[model samples]
Target: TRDQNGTWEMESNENFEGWMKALDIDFATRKIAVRLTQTLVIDQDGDNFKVKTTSTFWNYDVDFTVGVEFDEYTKSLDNRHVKALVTWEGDVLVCVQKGEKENRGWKKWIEGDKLYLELTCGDQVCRQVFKKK
Candidate 1:
């Protein structure tokens, strides 16, 4: 959460269960993940946030300082070899993952009361929606 000054107030997180499902995570992993809590710490500035996703079974961390581009790797996925560059398309967070697969990676944004995410690999695309805490 961020205050009017664009500074984030670290708080609890919800609806991560759906992310695991969208990724086709194994039942055992999901079971272990559901028991873990993900508390987000967002540092806001102009159009940026340092987003971190953490868990006991595994830790997923990312730094999105906005406008600026950075490389992202999916250590949790089989294609750990691939890397993507993430940037901001206005308020929407867009990521272009490159390596072996064409049109791979994801884009993220908030709409109304829900968070929308689009994942792509080759010509295949998967869309996932979730609610805010």
Candidate 2:
């Protein structure tokens, strides 16, 4: 929740679709990512947050802040480009990632004790979960 000025504090977790756009992956590898599931674990404390991108095939972790900026290389995916910022939208968290790919971003929301996440790149969309710990 937020103050009257729209400032607040909370934490979250997420997941990813590494192959929302495949790059050098062979057909078989692409198939694996296409059919497989990946999760991103996030922990927030005050103004700092840590995110872990996990999959059966790979894992990547990053730490960042709500208003501050950071660089992220989508190494396991298409090796895409991006700089991102996370901000609150009512009860949902919104991210606008500027990159080589247009309109590439994700969002996070919470319902009760469960976490919901949505990722988008191009025409593909991916969704996943995290039960609060």
Candidate 3:
């Protein structure tokens, strides 16, 4: 199994603006968020996890248990509320977010020396790779 608990520095950010656009996020802040550096700090406790996403422009965090659904407010990301569930599909961590938007979710998996984050909203998808320190 991959070590999901670590400080991950963002390497490549792909299609983040497009994914944000699908969520109806404003353009001004979208560009600002694009320029900001993102880092993920994750703490894993058995079947529970606390994930913290940080950037120079903003920050968002979530706490979740595997196979349990919880109410999630996107907050500074999109300001939308959703019912979110995270579960493991093989070794990959997958999340399904039920909300106003269609096909919304994210996937996290490790490959080689990188941790990959795949974000989805509507039909748009954003991918980011991170290197562990």
Candidate 4:
């Protein structure tokens, strides 16, 4: 897997509004989140990873070990508890979130100086690209 350390800032996003709507996010929150610049601060030490997502309106943190499933509450995103398991597919970090929502999961990968994130829920898929900072 790739070393996903350091900070990354969002450069572009697509279908994020649809994904947020599938998560039952209110209109006001969706409007704000869609316009805000999201940043990811990641600290990786071998199999252990700490990731923090920050924006102007909301923030979230996740701490887990690769391949280890853990129960976590999606505080700022969907406000639900989920069993999250992350694994490696080549250099990409693939996460499967088990919860009430169907097809809910995410993946992250790095290509040169860019970080790519893909979020999925129901039939909605959102892609966000971030630049290394």
Candidate 5:
């Protein structure tokens, strides 16, 4: 059973700036975020999970459970409020965020000791790959 538990170091980011822009993130943050090397610390226990991402400038954290929805405020990122729910689609953890933006959400999965994260906002989709550490 691939539990998706472990520390992962980011390897590559694709179209992150476009995603940030779609989410209305500020220019400075977008610039710094694109250049920063981020790390993901994920702790998963069955259907419950706590995920944190650390970067050079700031950090983001999320605590959620599958099939349950909660209000999420993205503080250091876009500073927006959304109602988020996570569910399992096969082996992938899929999240759907409902707020102002269209198609705003993310998906997480583990493949061959590597972690994959895909962020979506509006029509932009950003993919980030991470290696287990």
Candidate 6:
């Protein structure tokens, strides 16, 4: 709980372009997305939570209870609509997005001194590490 309840500024990104490619991202945006630094925010109060991403390029913000499913719009990334379910697997926050993209989702956790995010679509995976701010 403590590890995830603050702001995290990105430190490294690995193969994010491949993940975007799997989602059918356009060539122009993929070039720009690869260069933008991302910041993540997490707020939790009991069972309710809010997660947000901040960047000059784009933003994605969502609010949900741990065990609830919601309609999520990936307007910034892929411009797709999906039914997303969020839950906690131990200390790791995981989400499953159901839509045209196969096996699409992301998992976020605090490991060691960094916040690690693994984003997946199809067989493509992106690993990004961040430090708390």
34-125, model 3: which lDDT tens digit per residue? 89888999999888899999998689898899999999888777889999999999999999999999999999998876899999999999
lDDT of each: 0.57, 0.61, 0.91, 0.92, 0.90, 0.88
List the RMSD of every prediction in angstroms: 5.6, 6.4, 1.0, 1.1, 1.1, 1.5
Clashing pairs in 5: none
The superposed Cα distance between candidate 6 and the true structure at residue 84, in angstroms, equals: 0.8
Rank all candidate structures by their lDDT, best first, as comma-separated numbers: 4, 3, 5, 6, 2, 1
Looking at model 4, report the run of 10 residues with the lowest lDDT sum: 70-79
List, residue by residue over 56-127, the lDDT tens digit for candidate 4.
878888899998999989886778999989999999999999989999999999999999999999999999
- Which segments of candidate 3 are over 4 A away from where they belong? none
Better TM-score candidate (4, 6): 4
What lDDT is obtained when candidate 1 is compared to the true structure? 0.57
Per-residue error for 48 in candidate 6, Å, reads: 1.7
TM-score of 6: 0.91
Worst 10 residues of 2 by lDDT: 2-11
* TM-scores for every candidate against the unseen true structure: 0.56, 0.70, 0.95, 0.95, 0.95, 0.91
Residues 1-133 of candidate 1: C-alpha lDDT, one tens digit per residue: 1221221222333444555555556778877876765443345566556666555657656666545555556667432555556676766777776676677667766666555667666655666554555
Output the lDDT of residue 55, model 3. Answer: 90
Candidate 2 regions with alpha-carbon error over 4 angstroms: 1-19, 22-26, 34-39
Candidate 5 residue-wise lDDT, 34-123, digit = tens: 898999999999888899999888898988889999998988677889999999898988999999999999998888988999999999
Best by lDDT: 4
Clashing pairs in 6: none
For model 6, give the 10-residue run with minimal summed lDDT.
1-10
